[PDB]
């Protein structure tokens, strides 16, 4: 018992935790690409100029 | 008893703790690559300029 319940637990636990990391990959891919489109068409120097304003 | 319950505990304990470190590897790979895409297209000198603003 303590072997075969707890080992099917290991195998399903794999099937679910490569799952949560897959969720993390995909959501962070969307965050990534949509910051990239954000900054690249906002302006490479525009972000510098807007943050360097300290007069 | 105290041998064969506690040694199947060792073997499953392996199967689960190389597991938690595998979870750590994969989640930290996504964190890694998506900071890399972050900084490299944000700008190598942009991060310096935005942090060096102290006027």
PDB file of N, CA and C in Angstrom:
ATOM      1  N   UNK A   1       0.834  -1.198   0.000  1.00  0.00           N
ATOM      2  CA  UNK A   1       0.000   0.000   0.000  1.00  0.00           C
ATOM      3  C   UNK A   1       0.868   1.246   0.000  1.00  0.00           C
ATOM      4  N   UNK A   2       1.675   1.395   1.056  1.00  0.00           N
ATOM      5  CA  UNK A   2       2.485   2.594   1.229  1.00  0.00           C
ATOM      6  C   UNK A   2       3.466   2.766   0.075  1.00  0.00           C
ATOM      7  N   UNK A   3       3.694   1.714  -0.716  1.00  0.00           N
ATOM      8  CA  UNK A   3       4.452   1.877  -1.951  1.00  0.00           C
ATOM      9  C   UNK A   3       3.560   2.343  -3.099  1.00  0.00           C
ATOM     10  N   UNK A   4       2.470   1.625  -3.377  1.00  0.00           N
ATOM     11  CA  UNK A   4       1.781   1.811  -4.654  1.00  0.00           C
ATOM     12  C   UNK A   4       0.758   2.942  -4.662  1.00  0.00           C
ATOM     13  N   UNK A   5       0.268   3.430  -3.524  1.00  0.00           N
ATOM     14  CA  UNK A   5      -0.489   4.681  -3.512  1.00  0.00           C
ATOM     15  C   UNK A   5       0.445   5.874  -3.686  1.00  0.00           C
ATOM     16  N   UNK A   6       1.591   5.798  -3.029  1.00  0.00           N
ATOM     17  CA  UNK A   6       2.530   6.889  -2.840  1.00  0.00           C
ATOM     18  C   UNK A   6       3.445   7.029  -4.063  1.00  0.00           C
ATOM     19  N   UNK A   7       3.608   5.945  -4.829  1.00  0.00           N
ATOM     20  CA  UNK A   7       4.287   6.042  -6.120  1.00  0.00           C
ATOM     21  C   UNK A   7       3.350   6.487  -7.240  1.00  0.00           C
ATOM     22  N   UNK A   8       2.083   6.066  -7.232  1.00  0.00           N
ATOM     23  CA  UNK A   8       1.204   6.718  -8.199  1.00  0.00           C
ATOM     24  C   UNK A   8       1.064   8.197  -7.860  1.00  0.00           C
ATOM     25  N   UNK A   9       1.186   8.536  -6.574  1.00  0.00           N
ATOM     26  CA  UNK A   9       1.350   9.935  -6.204  1.00  0.00           C
ATOM     27  C   UNK A   9       2.586  10.551  -6.843  1.00  0.00           C
ATOM     28  N   UNK A  10       3.725   9.844  -6.881  1.00  0.00           N
ATOM     29  CA  UNK A  10       4.885  10.469  -7.527  1.00  0.00           C
ATOM     30  C   UNK A  10       4.597  10.729  -9.003  1.00  0.00           C
ATOM     31  N   UNK A  11       4.016   9.751  -9.699  1.00  0.00           N
ATOM     32  CA  UNK A  11       3.860   9.915 -11.145  1.00  0.00           C
ATOM     33  C   UNK A  11       2.853  11.017 -11.477  1.00  0.00           C
ATOM     34  N   UNK A  12       1.732  11.065 -10.765  1.00  0.00           N
ATOM     35  CA  UNK A  12       0.810  12.166 -10.983  1.00  0.00           C
ATOM     36  C   UNK A  12       1.415  13.486 -10.543  1.00  0.00           C
ATOM     37  N   UNK A  13       2.176  13.473  -9.450  1.00  0.00           N
ATOM     38  CA  UNK A  13       2.858  14.682  -9.010  1.00  0.00           C
ATOM     39  C   UNK A  13       3.776  15.213 -10.098  1.00  0.00           C
ATOM     40  N   UNK A  14       4.500  14.338 -10.813  1.00  0.00           N
ATOM     41  CA  UNK A  14       5.236  14.821 -11.983  1.00  0.00           C
ATOM     42  C   UNK A  14       4.275  15.468 -12.971  1.00  0.00           C
ATOM     43  N   UNK A  15       3.288  14.692 -13.436  1.00  0.00           N
ATOM     44  CA  UNK A  15       2.345  15.169 -14.446  1.00  0.00           C
ATOM     45  C   UNK A  15       1.702  16.506 -14.088  1.00  0.00           C
ATOM     46  N   UNK A  16       1.649  16.859 -12.804  1.00  0.00           N
ATOM     47  CA  UNK A  16       1.113  18.147 -12.369  1.00  0.00           C
ATOM     48  C   UNK A  16       2.173  19.218 -12.145  1.00  0.00           C
ATOM     49  N   UNK A  17       3.426  18.869 -11.848  1.00  0.00           N
ATOM     50  CA  UNK A  17       4.362  19.954 -11.559  1.00  0.00           C
ATOM     51  C   UNK A  17       5.216  20.331 -12.762  1.00  0.00           C
ATOM     52  N   UNK A  18       5.449  19.423 -13.712  1.00  0.00           N
ATOM     53  CA  UNK A  18       5.827  20.004 -14.995  1.00  0.00           C
ATOM     54  C   UNK A  18       4.678  20.822 -15.564  1.00  0.00           C
ATOM     55  N   UNK A  19       3.454  20.530 -15.126  1.00  0.00           N
ATOM     56  CA  UNK A  19       2.308  21.345 -15.507  1.00  0.00           C
ATOM     57  C   UNK A  19       2.383  22.770 -14.957  1.00  0.00           C
ATOM     58  N   UNK A  20       2.580  22.941 -13.643  1.00  0.00           N
ATOM     59  CA  UNK A  20       2.602  24.309 -13.117  1.00  0.00           C
ATOM     60  C   UNK A  20       3.742  25.112 -13.727  1.00  0.00           C
ATOM     61  N   UNK A  21       4.891  24.475 -13.952  1.00  0.00           N
ATOM     62  CA  UNK A  21       5.964  25.207 -14.608  1.00  0.00           C
ATOM     63  C   UNK A  21       5.605  25.515 -16.059  1.00  0.00           C
ATOM     64  N   UNK A  22       4.843  24.651 -16.742  1.00  0.00           N
ATOM     65  CA  UNK A  22       4.379  25.004 -18.083  1.00  0.00           C
ATOM     66  C   UNK A  22       3.462  26.223 -18.055  1.00  0.00           C
ATOM     67  N   UNK A  23       2.565  26.284 -17.068  1.00  0.00           N
ATOM     68  CA  UNK A  23       1.744  27.478 -16.874  1.00  0.00           C
ATOM     69  C   UNK A  23       2.620  28.709 -16.702  1.00  0.00           C
ATOM     70  N   UNK A  24       3.632  28.598 -15.837  1.00  0.00           N
ATOM     71  CA  UNK A  24       4.538  29.714 -15.600  1.00  0.00           C
ATOM     72  C   UNK A  24       5.255  30.128 -16.876  1.00  0.00           C
ATOM     73  N   UNK A  25       5.776  29.159 -17.640  1.00  0.00           N
ATOM     74  CA  UNK A  25       6.405  29.486 -18.914  1.00  0.00           C
ATOM     75  C   UNK A  25       5.461  30.270 -19.809  1.00  0.00           C
ATOM     76  N   UNK A  26       4.238  29.777 -20.012  1.00  0.00           N
ATOM     77  CA  UNK A  26       3.374  30.411 -21.009  1.00  0.00           C
ATOM     78  C   UNK A  26       2.920  31.807 -20.578  1.00  0.00           C
ATOM     79  N   UNK A  27       2.489  31.964 -19.321  1.00  0.00           N
ATOM     80  CA  UNK A  27       2.115  33.297 -18.856  1.00  0.00           C
ATOM     81  C   UNK A  27       3.303  34.249 -18.886  1.00  0.00           C
ATOM     82  N   UNK A  28       4.498  33.761 -18.571  1.00  0.00           N
ATOM     83  CA  UNK A  28       5.645  34.648 -18.590  1.00  0.00           C
ATOM     84  C   UNK A  28       6.120  34.928 -20.016  1.00  0.00           C
ATOM     85  N   UNK A  29       5.862  34.023 -20.972  1.00  0.00           N
ATOM     86  CA  UNK A  29       6.072  34.353 -22.384  1.00  0.00           C
ATOM     87  C   UNK A  29       5.180  35.502 -22.819  1.00  0.00           C
ATOM     88  N   UNK A  30       3.904  35.473 -22.427  1.00  0.00           N
ATOM     89  CA  UNK A  30       3.061  36.588 -22.856  1.00  0.00           C
ATOM     90  C   UNK A  30       3.524  37.884 -22.196  1.00  0.00           C
ATOM     91  N   UNK A  31       3.839  37.844 -20.894  1.00  0.00           N
ATOM     92  CA  UNK A  31       4.382  39.031 -20.235  1.00  0.00           C
ATOM     93  C   UNK A  31       5.630  39.535 -20.958  1.00  0.00           C
ATOM     94  N   UNK A  32       6.522  38.612 -21.320  1.00  0.00           N
ATOM     95  CA  UNK A  32       7.760  38.943 -22.008  1.00  0.00           C
ATOM     96  C   UNK A  32       7.513  39.638 -23.337  1.00  0.00           C
ATOM     97  N   UNK A  33       6.816  38.967 -24.254  1.00  0.00           N
ATOM     98  CA  UNK A  33       6.643  39.507 -25.599  1.00  0.00           C
ATOM     99  C   UNK A  33       5.876  40.824 -25.569  1.00  0.00           C
ATOM    100  N   UNK A  34       4.991  41.001 -24.584  1.00  0.00           N
ATOM    101  CA  UNK A  34       4.186  42.215 -24.597  1.00  0.00           C
ATOM    102  C   UNK A  34       4.812  43.325 -23.768  1.00  0.00           C
ATOM    103  N   UNK A  35       5.909  43.043 -23.062  1.00  0.00           N
ATOM    104  CA  UNK A  35       6.790  44.146 -22.694  1.00  0.00           C
ATOM    105  C   UNK A  35       7.733  44.490 -23.841  1.00  0.00           C
ATOM    106  N   UNK A  36       8.096  43.495 -24.656  1.00  0.00           N
ATOM    107  CA  UNK A  36       9.012  43.762 -25.762  1.00  0.00           C
ATOM    108  C   UNK A  36       8.377  44.678 -26.801  1.00  0.00           C
ATOM    109  N   UNK A  37       7.172  44.333 -27.264  1.00  0.00           N
ATOM    110  CA  UNK A  37       6.445  45.221 -28.163  1.00  0.00           C
ATOM    111  C   UNK A  37       6.196  46.586 -27.540  1.00  0.00           C
ATOM    112  N   UNK A  38       5.957  46.632 -26.232  1.00  0.00           N
ATOM    113  CA  UNK A  38       5.821  47.851 -25.449  1.00  0.00           C
ATOM    114  C   UNK A  38       7.025  48.766 -25.596  1.00  0.00           C
ATOM    115  N   UNK A  39       8.193  48.306 -25.142  1.00  0.00           N
ATOM    116  CA  UNK A  39       9.373  49.163 -25.110  1.00  0.00           C
ATOM    117  C   UNK A  39       9.903  49.470 -26.508  1.00  0.00           C
ATOM    118  N   UNK A  40       9.909  48.488 -27.418  1.00  0.00           N
ATOM    119  CA  UNK A  40      10.546  48.704 -28.713  1.00  0.00           C
ATOM    120  C   UNK A  40       9.828  49.748 -29.557  1.00  0.00           C
ATOM    121  N   UNK A  41       8.501  49.841 -29.454  1.00  0.00           N
ATOM    122  CA  UNK A  41       7.790  50.869 -30.202  1.00  0.00           C
ATOM    123  C   UNK A  41       7.467  52.079 -29.334  1.00  0.00           C
ATOM    124  N   UNK A  42       7.701  51.994 -28.019  1.00  0.00           N
ATOM    125  CA  UNK A  42       7.673  53.205 -27.208  1.00  0.00           C
ATOM    126  C   UNK A  42       8.907  54.055 -27.482  1.00  0.00           C
ATOM    127  N   UNK A  43      10.064  53.412 -27.624  1.00  0.00           N
ATOM    128  CA  UNK A  43      11.277  54.107 -27.983  1.00  0.00           C
ATOM    129  C   UNK A  43      12.455  53.717 -27.117  1.00  0.00           C
ATOM    130  N   UNK A  44      13.549  53.289 -27.754  1.00  0.00           N
ATOM    131  CA  UNK A  44      14.757  52.948 -26.984  1.00  0.00           C
ATOM    132  C   UNK A  44      15.303  54.105 -26.168  1.00  0.00           C
ATOM    133  N   UNK A  45      15.241  55.328 -26.690  1.00  0.00           N
ATOM    134  CA  UNK A  45      15.737  56.482 -25.967  1.00  0.00           C
ATOM    135  C   UNK A  45      14.650  57.232 -25.226  1.00  0.00           C
ATOM    136  N   UNK A  46      13.391  56.968 -25.586  1.00  0.00           N
ATOM    137  CA  UNK A  46      12.276  57.617 -24.904  1.00  0.00           C
ATOM    138  C   UNK A  46      12.196  57.193 -23.443  1.00  0.00           C
ATOM    139  N   UNK A  47      12.414  55.905 -23.167  1.00  0.00           N
ATOM    140  CA  UNK A  47      12.393  55.421 -21.791  1.00  0.00           C
ATOM    141  C   UNK A  47      13.531  56.029 -20.983  1.00  0.00           C
ATOM    142  N   UNK A  48      14.688  56.246 -21.611  1.00  0.00           N
ATOM    143  CA  UNK A  48      15.790  56.923 -20.936  1.00  0.00           C
ATOM    144  C   UNK A  48      15.448  58.379 -20.640  1.00  0.00           C
ATOM    145  N   UNK A  49      14.902  59.089 -21.632  1.00  0.00           N
ATOM    146  CA  UNK A  49      14.608  60.507 -21.463  1.00  0.00           C
ATOM    147  C   UNK A  49      13.509  60.746 -20.436  1.00  0.00           C
ATOM    148  N   UNK A  50      12.468  59.908 -20.431  1.00  0.00           N
ATOM    149  CA  UNK A  50      11.369  60.104 -19.491  1.00  0.00           C
ATOM    150  C   UNK A  50      11.800  59.840 -18.054  1.00  0.00           C
ATOM    151  N   UNK A  51      12.789  58.970 -17.855  1.00  0.00           N
ATOM    152  CA  UNK A  51      13.280  58.671 -16.517  1.00  0.00           C
ATOM    153  C   UNK A  51      14.395  59.607 -16.074  1.00  0.00           C
ATOM    154  N   UNK A  52      15.100  60.238 -17.021  1.00  0.00           N
ATOM    155  CA  UNK A  52      16.202  61.135 -16.675  1.00  0.00           C
ATOM    156  C   UNK A  52      15.746  62.553 -16.379  1.00  0.00           C
ATOM    157  N   UNK A  53      14.439  62.805 -16.334  1.00  0.00           N
ATOM    158  CA  UNK A  53      13.931  64.150 -16.083  1.00  0.00           C
ATOM    159  C   UNK A  53      13.995  64.450 -14.590  1.00  0.00           C
ATOM    160  N   UNK A  54      14.968  65.265 -14.189  1.00  0.00           N
ATOM    161  CA  UNK A  54      15.124  65.646 -12.805  1.00  0.00           C
ATOM    162  C   UNK A  54      15.406  67.122 -12.580  1.00  0.00           C
ATOM    163  N   UNK A  55      14.816  68.015 -13.398  1.00  0.00           N
ATOM    164  CA  UNK A  55      15.241  69.409 -13.267  1.00  0.00           C
ATOM    165  C   UNK A  55      14.608  70.107 -12.066  1.00  0.00           C
TER     166      UNK A  55
ATOM    167  N   UNK B   1      11.041  -4.634   9.949  1.00  0.00           N
ATOM    168  CA  UNK B   1      10.109  -3.528   9.758  1.00  0.00           C
ATOM    169  C   UNK B   1      10.863  -2.212   9.670  1.00  0.00           C
ATOM    170  N   UNK B   2      11.572  -1.873  10.753  1.00  0.00           N
ATOM    171  CA  UNK B   2      12.260  -0.592  10.839  1.00  0.00           C
ATOM    172  C   UNK B   2      13.306  -0.455   9.740  1.00  0.00           C
ATOM    173  N   UNK B   3      13.684  -1.560   9.091  1.00  0.00           N
ATOM    174  CA  UNK B   3      14.517  -1.462   7.898  1.00  0.00           C
ATOM    175  C   UNK B   3      13.677  -1.209   6.649  1.00  0.00           C
ATOM    176  N   UNK B   4      12.677  -2.053   6.384  1.00  0.00           N
ATOM    177  CA  UNK B   4      12.074  -2.073   5.053  1.00  0.00           C
ATOM    178  C   UNK B   4      10.959  -1.051   4.847  1.00  0.00           C
ATOM    179  N   UNK B   5      10.344  -0.492   5.886  1.00  0.00           N
ATOM    180  CA  UNK B   5       9.484   0.677   5.705  1.00  0.00           C
ATOM    181  C   UNK B   5      10.321   1.926   5.456  1.00  0.00           C
ATOM    182  N   UNK B   6      11.417   2.031   6.191  1.00  0.00           N
ATOM    183  CA  UNK B   6      12.241   3.221   6.313  1.00  0.00           C
ATOM    184  C   UNK B   6      13.230   3.312   5.146  1.00  0.00           C
ATOM    185  N   UNK B   7      13.544   2.170   4.521  1.00  0.00           N
ATOM    186  CA  UNK B   7      14.307   2.191   3.276  1.00  0.00           C
ATOM    187  C   UNK B   7      13.422   2.420   2.053  1.00  0.00           C
ATOM    188  N   UNK B   8      12.199   1.886   2.026  1.00  0.00           N
ATOM    189  CA  UNK B   8      11.343   2.342   0.935  1.00  0.00           C
ATOM    190  C   UNK B   8      11.051   3.828   1.092  1.00  0.00           C
ATOM    191  N   UNK B   9      11.045   4.316   2.335  1.00  0.00           N
ATOM    192  CA  UNK B   9      11.059   5.757   2.552  1.00  0.00           C
ATOM    193  C   UNK B   9      12.282   6.413   1.927  1.00  0.00           C
ATOM    194  N   UNK B  10      13.477   5.817   2.046  1.00  0.00           N
ATOM    195  CA  UNK B  10      14.624   6.475   1.409  1.00  0.00           C
ATOM    196  C   UNK B  10      14.428   6.545  -0.103  1.00  0.00           C
ATOM    197  N   UNK B  11      13.988   5.446  -0.718  1.00  0.00           N
ATOM    198  CA  UNK B  11      13.928   5.436  -2.180  1.00  0.00           C
ATOM    199  C   UNK B  11      12.857   6.394  -2.701  1.00  0.00           C
ATOM    200  N   UNK B  12      11.686   6.415  -2.074  1.00  0.00           N
ATOM    201  CA  UNK B  12      10.691   7.393  -2.479  1.00  0.00           C
ATOM    202  C   UNK B  12      11.145   8.803  -2.154  1.00  0.00           C
ATOM    203  N   UNK B  13      11.819   8.982  -1.021  1.00  0.00           N
ATOM    204  CA  UNK B  13      12.358  10.290  -0.678  1.00  0.00           C
ATOM    205  C   UNK B  13      13.306  10.784  -1.759  1.00  0.00           C
ATOM    206  N   UNK B  14      14.155   9.910  -2.319  1.00  0.00           N
ATOM    207  CA  UNK B  14      14.932  10.330  -3.486  1.00  0.00           C
ATOM    208  C   UNK B  14      13.997  10.771  -4.602  1.00  0.00           C
ATOM    209  N   UNK B  15      13.118   9.859  -5.038  1.00  0.00           N
ATOM    210  CA  UNK B  15      12.217  10.132  -6.157  1.00  0.00           C
ATOM    211  C   UNK B  15      11.436  11.434  -5.998  1.00  0.00           C
ATOM    212  N   UNK B  16      11.256  11.918  -4.768  1.00  0.00           N
ATOM    213  CA  UNK B  16      10.578  13.189  -4.522  1.00  0.00           C
ATOM    214  C   UNK B  16      11.521  14.374  -4.353  1.00  0.00           C
ATOM    215  N   UNK B  17      12.774  14.179  -3.936  1.00  0.00           N
ATOM    216  CA  UNK B  17      13.589  15.372  -3.715  1.00  0.00           C
ATOM    217  C   UNK B  17      14.494  15.696  -4.894  1.00  0.00           C
ATOM    218  N   UNK B  18      14.877  14.716  -5.716  1.00  0.00           N
ATOM    219  CA  UNK B  18      15.299  15.187  -7.030  1.00  0.00           C
ATOM    220  C   UNK B  18      14.130  15.826  -7.763  1.00  0.00           C
ATOM    221  N   UNK B  19      12.906  15.470  -7.376  1.00  0.00           N
ATOM    222  CA  UNK B  19      11.726  16.124  -7.922  1.00  0.00           C
ATOM    223  C   UNK B  19      11.636  17.602  -7.536  1.00  0.00           C
ATOM    224  N   UNK B  20      11.717  17.932  -6.240  1.00  0.00           N
ATOM    225  CA  UNK B  20      11.580  19.345  -5.875  1.00  0.00           C
ATOM    226  C   UNK B  20      12.690  20.182  -6.498  1.00  0.00           C
ATOM    227  N   UNK B  21      13.903  19.637  -6.573  1.00  0.00           N
ATOM    228  CA  UNK B  21      14.956  20.391  -7.236  1.00  0.00           C
ATOM    229  C   UNK B  21      14.682  20.503  -8.735  1.00  0.00           C
ATOM    230  N   UNK B  22      14.051  19.502  -9.361  1.00  0.00           N
ATOM    231  CA  UNK B  22      13.662  19.661 -10.761  1.00  0.00           C
ATOM    232  C   UNK B  22      12.644  20.784 -10.934  1.00  0.00           C
ATOM    233  N   UNK B  23      11.672  20.867 -10.022  1.00  0.00           N
ATOM    234  CA  UNK B  23      10.738  21.992 -10.021  1.00  0.00           C
ATOM    235  C   UNK B  23      11.488  23.311  -9.934  1.00  0.00           C
ATOM    236  N   UNK B  24      12.438  23.392  -8.999  1.00  0.00           N
ATOM    237  CA  UNK B  24      13.223  24.608  -8.833  1.00  0.00           C
ATOM    238  C   UNK B  24      13.996  24.946 -10.098  1.00  0.00           C
ATOM    239  N   UNK B  25      14.655  23.954 -10.710  1.00  0.00           N
ATOM    240  CA  UNK B  25      15.348  24.198 -11.969  1.00  0.00           C
ATOM    241  C   UNK B  25      14.411  24.786 -13.008  1.00  0.00           C
ATOM    242  N   UNK B  26      13.253  24.162 -13.233  1.00  0.00           N
ATOM    243  CA  UNK B  26      12.416  24.599 -14.350  1.00  0.00           C
ATOM    244  C   UNK B  26      11.811  25.985 -14.114  1.00  0.00           C
ATOM    245  N   UNK B  27      11.274  26.235 -12.914  1.00  0.00           N
ATOM    246  CA  UNK B  27      10.752  27.569 -12.632  1.00  0.00           C
ATOM    247  C   UNK B  27      11.852  28.621 -12.694  1.00  0.00           C
ATOM    248  N   UNK B  28      13.058  28.285 -12.246  1.00  0.00           N
ATOM    249  CA  UNK B  28      14.121  29.269 -12.293  1.00  0.00           C
ATOM    250  C   UNK B  28      14.677  29.436 -13.707  1.00  0.00           C
ATOM    251  N   UNK B  29      14.571  28.412 -14.568  1.00  0.00           N
ATOM    252  CA  UNK B  29      14.859  28.605 -15.991  1.00  0.00           C
ATOM    253  C   UNK B  29      13.906  29.611 -16.613  1.00  0.00           C
ATOM    254  N   UNK B  30      12.610  29.503 -16.306  1.00  0.00           N
ATOM    255  CA  UNK B  30      11.709  30.480 -16.913  1.00  0.00           C
ATOM    256  C   UNK B  30      12.007  31.878 -16.378  1.00  0.00           C
ATOM    257  N   UNK B  31      12.225  32.010 -15.064  1.00  0.00           N
ATOM    258  CA  UNK B  31      12.612  33.308 -14.512  1.00  0.00           C
ATOM    259  C   UNK B  31      13.861  33.846 -15.204  1.00  0.00           C
ATOM    260  N   UNK B  32      14.856  32.977 -15.398  1.00  0.00           N
ATOM    261  CA  UNK B  32      16.110  33.348 -16.038  1.00  0.00           C
ATOM    262  C   UNK B  32      15.903  33.867 -17.451  1.00  0.00           C
ATOM    263  N   UNK B  33      15.339  33.038 -18.329  1.00  0.00           N
ATOM    264  CA  UNK B  33      15.221  33.409 -19.734  1.00  0.00           C
ATOM    265  C   UNK B  33      14.345  34.643 -19.908  1.00  0.00           C
ATOM    266  N   UNK B  34      13.375  34.842 -19.009  1.00  0.00           N
ATOM    267  CA  UNK B  34      12.472  35.965 -19.214  1.00  0.00           C
ATOM    268  C   UNK B  34      12.935  37.214 -18.480  1.00  0.00           C
ATOM    269  N   UNK B  35      13.995  37.115 -17.676  1.00  0.00           N
ATOM    270  CA  UNK B  35      14.747  38.329 -17.380  1.00  0.00           C
ATOM    271  C   UNK B  35      15.741  38.634 -18.495  1.00  0.00           C
ATOM    272  N   UNK B  36      16.249  37.595 -19.164  1.00  0.00           N
ATOM    273  CA  UNK B  36      17.219  37.826 -20.232  1.00  0.00           C
ATOM    274  C   UNK B  36      16.587  38.560 -21.408  1.00  0.00           C
ATOM    275  N   UNK B  37      15.455  38.053 -21.906  1.00  0.00           N
ATOM    276  CA  UNK B  37      14.725  38.766 -22.948  1.00  0.00           C
ATOM    277  C   UNK B  37      14.312  40.162 -22.504  1.00  0.00           C
ATOM    278  N   UNK B  38      13.971  40.326 -21.228  1.00  0.00           N
ATOM    279  CA  UNK B  38      13.672  41.604 -20.601  1.00  0.00           C
ATOM    280  C   UNK B  38      14.800  42.608 -20.774  1.00  0.00           C
ATOM    281  N   UNK B  39      15.964  42.313 -20.195  1.00  0.00           N
ATOM    282  CA  UNK B  39      17.060  43.275 -20.185  1.00  0.00           C
ATOM    283  C   UNK B  39      17.667  43.478 -21.571  1.00  0.00           C
ATOM    284  N   UNK B  40      17.827  42.407 -22.359  1.00  0.00           N
ATOM    285  CA  UNK B  40      18.538  42.540 -23.626  1.00  0.00           C
ATOM    286  C   UNK B  40      17.799  43.414 -24.629  1.00  0.00           C
ATOM    287  N   UNK B  41      16.464  43.392 -24.625  1.00  0.00           N
ATOM    288  CA  UNK B  41      15.726  44.261 -25.531  1.00  0.00           C
ATOM    289  C   UNK B  41      15.235  45.521 -24.831  1.00  0.00           C
ATOM    290  N   UNK B  42      15.375  45.603 -23.504  1.00  0.00           N
ATOM    291  CA  UNK B  42      15.181  46.886 -22.841  1.00  0.00           C
ATOM    292  C   UNK B  42      16.353  47.814 -23.130  1.00  0.00           C
ATOM    293  N   UNK B  43      17.569  47.272 -23.121  1.00  0.00           N
ATOM    294  CA  UNK B  43      18.741  48.035 -23.478  1.00  0.00           C
ATOM    295  C   UNK B  43      19.880  47.855 -22.497  1.00  0.00           C
ATOM    296  N   UNK B  44      21.052  47.465 -23.008  1.00  0.00           N
ATOM    297  CA  UNK B  44      22.223  47.326 -22.127  1.00  0.00           C
ATOM    298  C   UNK B  44      22.603  48.612 -21.415  1.00  0.00           C
ATOM    299  N   UNK B  45      22.475  49.759 -22.077  1.00  0.00           N
ATOM    300  CA  UNK B  45      22.813  51.027 -21.461  1.00  0.00           C
ATOM    301  C   UNK B  45      21.613  51.747 -20.885  1.00  0.00           C
ATOM    302  N   UNK B  46      20.412  51.327 -21.292  1.00  0.00           N
ATOM    303  CA  UNK B  46      19.197  51.939 -20.765  1.00  0.00           C
ATOM    304  C   UNK B  46      19.044  51.671 -19.273  1.00  0.00           C
ATOM    305  N   UNK B  47      19.352  50.447 -18.837  1.00  0.00           N
ATOM    306  CA  UNK B  47      19.268  50.115 -17.418  1.00  0.00           C
ATOM    307  C   UNK B  47      20.284  50.913 -16.613  1.00  0.00           C
ATOM    308  N   UNK B  48      21.463  51.168 -17.185  1.00  0.00           N
ATOM    309  CA  UNK B  48      22.448  52.016 -16.522  1.00  0.00           C
ATOM    310  C   UNK B  48      21.960  53.456 -16.418  1.00  0.00           C
ATOM    311  N   UNK B  49      21.431  53.999 -17.519  1.00  0.00           N
ATOM    312  CA  UNK B  49      21.003  55.394 -17.534  1.00  0.00           C
ATOM    313  C   UNK B  49      19.813  55.638 -16.616  1.00  0.00           C
ATOM    314  N   UNK B  50      18.851  54.711 -16.582  1.00  0.00           N
ATOM    315  CA  UNK B  50      17.671  54.904 -15.746  1.00  0.00           C
ATOM    316  C   UNK B  50      18.014  54.839 -14.263  1.00  0.00           C
ATOM    317  N   UNK B  51      19.055  54.093 -13.900  1.00  0.00           N
ATOM    318  CA  UNK B  51      19.468  53.989 -12.507  1.00  0.00           C
ATOM    319  C   UNK B  51      20.461  55.069 -12.104  1.00  0.00           C
ATOM    320  N   UNK B  52      21.179  55.657 -13.069  1.00  0.00           N
ATOM    321  CA  UNK B  52      22.169  56.686 -12.756  1.00  0.00           C
ATOM    322  C   UNK B  52      21.571  58.079 -12.657  1.00  0.00           C
ATOM    323  N   UNK B  53      20.249  58.209 -12.728  1.00  0.00           N
ATOM    324  CA  UNK B  53      19.608  59.519 -12.666  1.00  0.00           C
ATOM    325  C   UNK B  53      19.533  59.984 -11.216  1.00  0.00           C
ATOM    326  N   UNK B  54      20.398  60.926 -10.850  1.00  0.00           N
ATOM    327  CA  UNK B  54      20.416  61.469  -9.512  1.00  0.00           C
ATOM    328  C   UNK B  54      20.551  62.982  -9.440  1.00  0.00           C
ATOM    329  N   UNK B  55      19.948  63.720 -10.392  1.00  0.00           N
ATOM    330  CA  UNK B  55      20.240  65.154 -10.396  1.00  0.00           C
ATOM    331  C   UNK B  55      19.462  65.916  -9.327  1.00  0.00           C
TER     332      UNK B  55
END
